[PDB]
Write a protein that binds this DNA or RNA. Structure first.
Length: 270
DNA sequence: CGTCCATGTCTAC
DNA sequence: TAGACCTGGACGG
């Protein structure tokens, strides 16, 4: 998952858990290296917000719930496979690694953090990752300024296909979005990032870093992902113009990750 | 059986 | 920077 997936996951949690009351402990699969979540409430609601490639749950005990408890924030990163799913308490998926259980009345449900591969991670802090750039979806002006102010940074020596994955400046952009973005402007992926950015100091590279992932969010669906039917997944595959599409060339950036492009690879190519 | 590939970090050398 | 962290699917023989 990349920014749009984290965003729709946030929306999924909020819409699904609007009318739900949770109760009891927050349960961790005994194979997850991530920390135990010390939290018990007789009655609590669950809300979410997203910032680039991170999502924040807030667990909010209701009035008079017991034990006396202050709200608790957890921040998730999903790595290659994470996901959130509302399931029947007795049909936990394989790889439901963290699990929030509905109190009665109503049919017993588990909001599960599902992460097949265990590249996902969570922290008790409630805080966004120190160093991560602003969210390209929700802090666009902040995102734009945070780049143009810092072209001096060695980050921008790298080729543009590489800089776009540095979450310090492009929080929320990942390997499908970088491909999709450059294709829209036909910027060679191994053009030097400083050259392409110095220019702006008919939409431009930074406009698209916002608007292109925002197109994924406005499919509905779960962006690149199977939930909301294996119907919405094909609605994404049809949106894609570059990433994996027949006809397109592809190469490995200096860190093994595959960039899909059309035509000219550009000057700093392997 | 086997090999390779996948929406991302994270860290040891 | 090579390597680690993981599982499973789409392919090969």
């Amino acid at each position: 998952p990349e920014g749009p997936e984290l965003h729709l996951a946030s929306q999924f949690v909020n819409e699904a858990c609007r009318a739900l009351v949770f109760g009891g402990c927050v349960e961790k699969s005994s194979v997850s290296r991530n920390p135990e979540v010390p939290f018990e409430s007789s009655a609590y609601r669950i809300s979410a917000s997203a910032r680039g490639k991170e999502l924040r749950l807030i667990l909010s005990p209701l009035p008079g719930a017991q034990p006396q408890q202050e709200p608790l924030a957890l921040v998730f990163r999903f790595g290659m496979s994470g996901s959130f799913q509302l399931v029947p308490r007795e049909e936990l998926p394989r790889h439901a690694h963290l699990r929030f259980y509905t109190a009665p009345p109503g049919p017993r449900l588990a909001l599960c953090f599902v992460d097949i591969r265990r590249f996902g991670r969570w922290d008790l802090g409630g805080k966004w990752q120190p160093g991560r750039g602003p969210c390209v979806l929700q802090e666009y002006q902040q995102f734009r300024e945070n780049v143009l102010r810092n072209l001096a940074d060695k980050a921008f020596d790298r080729p543009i296909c590489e800089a776009l994955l540095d979450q310090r400046f492009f929080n929320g952009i990942g390997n499908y979005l970088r491909a999709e973005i450059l294709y829209r402007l036909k910027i060679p992926p191994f053009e030097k990032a400083r050259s392409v950015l110095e220019a702006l100091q008919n939409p431009d590279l930074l406009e698209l870093c916002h608007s292109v992932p925002k197109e994924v969010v406005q499919l509905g669906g779960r962006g690149y992902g199977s939930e909301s039917g294996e119907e919405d997944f094909a609605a994404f595959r049809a949106w894609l113009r570059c990433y994996g599409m027949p006809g397109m060339s592809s190469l490995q950036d200096r860190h093994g990750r595959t960039i899909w492009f059309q035509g000219d690879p550009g000057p700093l190519a392997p």
